[PDB]
Amino acid sequence: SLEAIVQNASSDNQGIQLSAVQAARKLLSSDRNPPIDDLIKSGILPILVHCLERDDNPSLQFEAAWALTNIASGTSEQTQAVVQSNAVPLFLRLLHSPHQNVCEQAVWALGNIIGDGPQCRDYVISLGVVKPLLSFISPSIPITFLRNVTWVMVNLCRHKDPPPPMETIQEILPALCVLIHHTDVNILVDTVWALSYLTDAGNEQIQMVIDSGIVPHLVPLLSHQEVKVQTAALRAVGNIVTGTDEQTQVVLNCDALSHFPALLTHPKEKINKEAVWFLSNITAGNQQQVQAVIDANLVPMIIHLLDKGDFGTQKEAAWAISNLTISGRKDQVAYLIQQNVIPPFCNLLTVKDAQVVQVVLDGLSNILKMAEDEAETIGNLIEECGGLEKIEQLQNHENEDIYKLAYEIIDQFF
């Protein structure tokens, strides 16, 4: 009976009050479809927030913080009701409790609030959460507490519109530099996912991540035994190599490409796909980065995935092939030709994905444009592949660019 719980939670008899707040916590924690709206509409929120002030009773504030944590774990509606009740300043104050459980429950609640969205985390950031949060990182912290802190850190880096403020990224990067040397798998997964969110926010953030010194410790995680670590690390370095040529070179200079044989042959197709996506952002670089892909012996496997991979991997591989014809020399492209790129590249011309068909027609045109001395022979390869029929029936395609360069290629090179 919730009206009675709310009344009792007000009581000046401590036993009555603690019992009521515990009954609310139990209603919010016993399964994972708690009656959050019922408790909110009861009026219990200001009483719990008041209980957060009871520094004389660490058990009372722990129970209230737990109840509020679980209300804040609901819909954005329910999280914002907690925020509207002024809980955030009281939680920030609890970060300085001498009582580790109380601190931890305050961290947990703030993590739920921060995770609701970017204006919400900006409010929590403006009130100074980051420094006390990061001050918890220590060899003496219980590991389950450290995992809660790192989850909150991921939550602080998760929204990119807008991304967290520059000053916050500057504060969080040294903590991630510390945690990337941790052995616990959960810590590492959180740390690297936080890095993947930070590197997805543009080239200035990528430069900050590079400037922190963390990349030489991120790249070796591409070969971690835990596939969740590998997945996150591959996302993060992939984001970095979407940057400039010099930012890409930083990653390459960490021995990145030596990790890719195992990613390109990985049993998990999502790994193969992200790996080829990464590689495609390398073959879009200068001739030396193209050559680095060639000398790492990755091209036969890229072509194999272009041939036999899942559709997503095939799309990334078509991009890696087409990209190589940007700053690649004629001999690098000729090496592609000697690796029998043409049949599995032409078989993509039938896919209904107009973007893929475009990219493949692009690459074919570029390679034909610069292979003069035996362009005719390459035409044979396109012809005897069955690819010339693909182009001569893409003649009747819907997309303007598609049939445009289909007619163009069939005119000049056939």
Partner: peptide
């Protein structure tokens, strides 16, 4: 893409 955003504290 598995990294939690919101976490109910259940009694362990």
């Amino acid at each position: 893409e598995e990294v939690q955003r919101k976490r109910q504290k259940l009694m362990p």
